[PDB]
Design a protein around this nucleic acid. Sequence first.
RNA 1: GACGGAGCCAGCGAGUCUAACCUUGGCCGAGAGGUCUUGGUAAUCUUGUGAAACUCCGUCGUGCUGGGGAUAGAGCAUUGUAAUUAUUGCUCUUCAACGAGGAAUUCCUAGUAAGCGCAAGUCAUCAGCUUGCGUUGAUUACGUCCCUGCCCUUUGUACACACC
RNA 2: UAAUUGCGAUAACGAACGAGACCUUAACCUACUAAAUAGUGGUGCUAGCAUUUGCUGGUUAUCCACUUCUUAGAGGGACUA
Lengths: 206, 143, 67, 141, 65, 101, 63, 313
Amino acid sequence: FTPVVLATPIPEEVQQAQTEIKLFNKWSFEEVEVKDASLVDYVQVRQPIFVAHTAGRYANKRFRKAQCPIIERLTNSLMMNGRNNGKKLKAVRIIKHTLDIINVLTDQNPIQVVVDAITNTGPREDTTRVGGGGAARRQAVDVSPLRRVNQAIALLTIGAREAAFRNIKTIAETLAEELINAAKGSSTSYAIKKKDELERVAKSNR
Amino acid sequence: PGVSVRDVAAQDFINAYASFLQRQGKLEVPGYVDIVKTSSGNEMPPQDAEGWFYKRAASVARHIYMRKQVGVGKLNKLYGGAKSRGVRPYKHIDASGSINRKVLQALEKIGIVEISPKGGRRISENGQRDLDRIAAQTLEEDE
Amino acid sequence: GRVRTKTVKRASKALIERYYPKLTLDFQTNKRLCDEIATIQSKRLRNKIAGYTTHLMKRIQKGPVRG
Amino acid sequence: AVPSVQTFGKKKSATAVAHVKAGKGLIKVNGSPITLVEPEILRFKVYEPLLLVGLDKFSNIDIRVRVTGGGHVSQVYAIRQAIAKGLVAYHQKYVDEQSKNELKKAFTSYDRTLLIADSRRPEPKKFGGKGARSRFQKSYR
Amino acid sequence: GQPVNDFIDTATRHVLMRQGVLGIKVKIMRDPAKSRTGPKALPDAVTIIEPKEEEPILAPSVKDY
Amino acid sequence: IIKIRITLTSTKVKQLENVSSNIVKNAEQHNLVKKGPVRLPTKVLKISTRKTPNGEGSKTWETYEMRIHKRYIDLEAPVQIVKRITQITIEPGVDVEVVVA
Amino acid sequence: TPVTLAKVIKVLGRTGSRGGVTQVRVEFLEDTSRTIVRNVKGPVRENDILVLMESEREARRLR
Amino acid sequence: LVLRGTLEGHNGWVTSLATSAGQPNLLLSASRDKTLISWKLTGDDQKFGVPVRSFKGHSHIVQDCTLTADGAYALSASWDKTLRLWDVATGETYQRFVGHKSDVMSVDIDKKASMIISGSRDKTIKVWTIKGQCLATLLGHNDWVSQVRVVPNEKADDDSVTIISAGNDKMVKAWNLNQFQIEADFIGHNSNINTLTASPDGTLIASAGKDGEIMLWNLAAKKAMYTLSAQDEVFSLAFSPNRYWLAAATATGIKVFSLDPQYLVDDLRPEFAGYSKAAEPHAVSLAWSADGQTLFAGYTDNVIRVWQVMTAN
RNA sequence: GACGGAGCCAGCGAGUCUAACCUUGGCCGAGAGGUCUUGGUAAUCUUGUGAAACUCCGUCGUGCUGGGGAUAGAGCAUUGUAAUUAUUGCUCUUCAACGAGGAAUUCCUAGUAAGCGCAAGUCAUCAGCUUGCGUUGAUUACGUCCCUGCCCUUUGUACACACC
RNA sequence: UAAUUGCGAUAACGAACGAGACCUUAACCUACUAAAUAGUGGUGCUAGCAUUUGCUGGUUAUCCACUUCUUAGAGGGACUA
Ligand SMILES: [Mg+2]
Ligand SMILES: [Mg+2]
Ligand SMILES: [Mg+2]
Ligand SMILES: [Mg+2]
Ligand SMILES: [Mg+2]
Ligand SMILES: [Mg+2]
Ligand SMILES: [Mg+2]
Ligand SMILES: [Mg+2]
Ligand SMILES: [Mg+2]
Ligand SMILES: [Mg+2]
Ligand SMILES: [Mg+2]
Ligand SMILES: [Mg+2]
Ligand SMILES: [Mg+2]
């Protein structure tokens, strides 16, 4: 393994793991694949990241948010409501705790759980607005894959917010159970419930 | 192979130095330690009543080591916080100068800090020595 | 956008009209030329003059223009 | 003697001055080890350079960073630059161009620009609003 | 612009008559060519000096010294 | 042979600059050590007030700025040379003060 | 379910009264010569993969 | 003369290339990426040379680099009105010449490494010593002086060194520096002039400009020989010393010509891809080796490359 | 998330002469504050303005509750000639509505919104205001003329104080 | 085109104001000039621990050296290359 010992410690755990494979805190970034098509090249899980806090410019041009890795997008969507607009260091801790709870509930990769949740809650068919003199109509329209991913992350975080507003359960637990049920759609996630109502209203209004 | 309070962590070292000052006990605390709020910007007294003054002593001793010379005004500015003025917005209000000076002169009468010219209080010989030795035992606390 | 105005267009046209053999195809050399044979009072304006002059040089090498 | 170089790292207001010299191989910020900086979860953000390139290339370097200005995140993102640019400057001035270059390839392959700083600066505030772009709420009635 | 701050001089004068006071605004733009300090032209003029010409063939030869 | 300090300040940058150029020039043909001038941070006198004389109209504010530029040079010169510098170098607007210590 | 994986070729124009629905020319990833127009709600580039459950609406300009 | 592999490492037009007579395994490249990179050659199928040292310290584009013979003193002339003298190892500035009022065009050291000469954009040529004393100022050119090139005199280091220079008012001046006056002037150029060079023996000048004619002059008899169109913008000029040829980097590629007798040798074409026919990357710089087996050509795609003299078949 | 400890980081600026300004440091005081000195006409001294939000460890625990701090009573200080319809500051006690807000409607495309404090202005005292500054820093467009309007052209007009 | 901004067309030609240009500020300069009223490194004196070189500090008349960070002034840089 060849450790190099200095008077500064540089502990062996971070030494070995992050010299061998470019991880999360301690999580493998390889062997994760997007289980379905039509979300590749947007769900950015090919370039690894240590910690979701990056000073990356993504809102300058048109699709640098698509180039951005997905875990930072999960933190940035965990960020909303006016009490917590700014505290993304806190959002990173919540996300680390959430993925720890994911590991405890299921032995599989938490980033794979996040990918499966986004894949299974992307709303395939939305409904847009038409002038339509009289009852001011709505017409069913498909969804671009970036809008799929964005609405998926927004649904996950809004569900966690409203299900852990006034409860004993913390944001990390609520986000973890929502991510588990969105990974296995069991008609229990608020994200998949909003997906299902979007699909049924689209197939009614088409 | 080379030990300093800069080289040891803050929270751990502060807990261990508070425990050492508890085990020694020669601090001659004032009588109103249970009364105070430690600042006018507080509304509740400190929870750990048996060791809050000694934790303050540990923090102040570490501060005097880290800096050249500071006074009760600098300590009050540091240990102050945000005052809840009701419906009005928060402000920064300084801490309790009485307990700050009581813990300063208590560290003096131990022999950890002394009077430094151009005004001020600076770390002592045996104060730098015993802060460095307890920094050692916190470094080699590993099993 | 990056539409160039009558000042830079008129000036660059006059320079390329009466200084064709001396002026080059490179922006750096061409702006040193503009600095030396024009008493322009603005640095950014001088850079704009030289840039449009280089554009006209490339178009002249490509083919004959009407202007 | 003392073959040292001085580099800097800036974010929005933080200036981190890194003294990089040939020594035993220690890495310290404000007279304290890197393993003791307090952004809590950004301990890995500091390690990012040291880690990426490899501890080996630091097993002969003493770097000491003095830090001024800007809040805690500004502080840490500045260390990152200094312990990476001081690195790049040292490999420029003393060792092989292929080594410095492949370090540049790794840095720009993974980069949050690292070696270059962010050009984003706080724009000035305008009258009629508490923010720089947002204006006061008007009523019409 | 700063050309107005550089070249233009403005004056305002209140004139009292038997009615209400009259306001005289006088504005004078100085020429740039007879200035003694500062810029000698507006920041728009690109004055281009004319070149001189030489015969091309020249009967290519050398000179002895 | 007395070691004194000369400190100049003004609001107009260019006349301050050629005052300082005159001073450093004269010191350089009569060298004392070298003592190039030291340039202080520019003090921006900021005064913000309303545009409107009355209180009607859109709430538009304005910020007038004065700029104070200030330099110092150290000289270690005899009496008459200190004098001849201090009365020969003088221009409008630039205020120059000399201190013995 | 008849899920269909489409793949764009061309962007036609941004229809819709509010201007958010984009017209695209897509193929279907099994026949090259089978291409139709689609209304999309989100932002669309060239070379991306869309999802249909129904592929024969052949819609047009929205008012 | 085939391609011996491509050479990368720059981000600007490679303005100058040079070698060392004492150590023939070294290259120096000055480019428009504001740095001067010295390379050690290896002879690999592709990477002929590996960069070993990079030199910085300019605030604008560097144009020319010149070395002493053994390879220990290196001058650069750069458009921030700077001249600077490095060593090769450990990369520190030995000295900086300042005093030029504008961009600097060309620098040359004499054969005994005592006299440094710099022609520059303020229509003038400074001549300096090694330590940094301005020995003299020389005028005469009404326009941009293009380049200067030293000329060594006869054997046993005779008590004279000559110099030639070209300036963009159709003028070529040959000077002697024993007591600083003018000795020869050359006229005849149709157009703009950019590049000349002097023979290794030290009696021939070849000079070149905008419209493709090459003139050659001789100082021993002080007479003109001829002129030769290259049909394009010729940029750089070099002498193959032992084999005695004329390499000319031009706006379309390389034209290498022969002197004994007068015949064209090669219109050298590099293969390119991805570019249209109206945006062909032209040439910038040429250099010959110490014994002239190798010419290095620096090109506008930030790319240097090398072709070695070999039998035709 | 509130509280309690510890960790601990900015930038824009202002400041006294015939006046009494910004105040360090020492001491008294729970606190506000007081007193003895000191530095500064200022990149030097106040001031590293050791700011707050944050970070860590702990108490609490879905309870209008340790959330929230209005409305009240008593007392202690400071400014001022003078505080009574409390100038403000501090201490204890009192502990109300508020459980995320209907028709409507405002601002906003990146270091922007939003959160967070600080300085200056008015100032003897009094910021919940404004003007600036920095700290932390998202989402969602990269379009359209549907609503509200604007510019140009054509067209119609019984309008010209001009579609009110 | 942000722009009666330009290309062009053309009973119009040649101009003018405005826009733009300009000025201030925020960004870059390990290139210049510098600087105990900004710093940095070394040297002395001195304090701890380790002692084996070291690590963390303090020090105004301990000097010496430098300007990377800090300030400015003169410039350069982007002109869509
Ligand atoms: Mg606190
Ligand atoms: Mg609040
Ligand atoms: Mg704001
Ligand atoms: Mg707290
Ligand atoms: Mg500060
Ligand atoms: Mg409360
Ligand atoms: Mg106020
Ligand atoms: Mg009042
Ligand atoms: Mg008011
Ligand atoms: Mg009609
Ligand atoms: Mg009428
Ligand atoms: Mg009507
Ligand atoms: Mg010392």
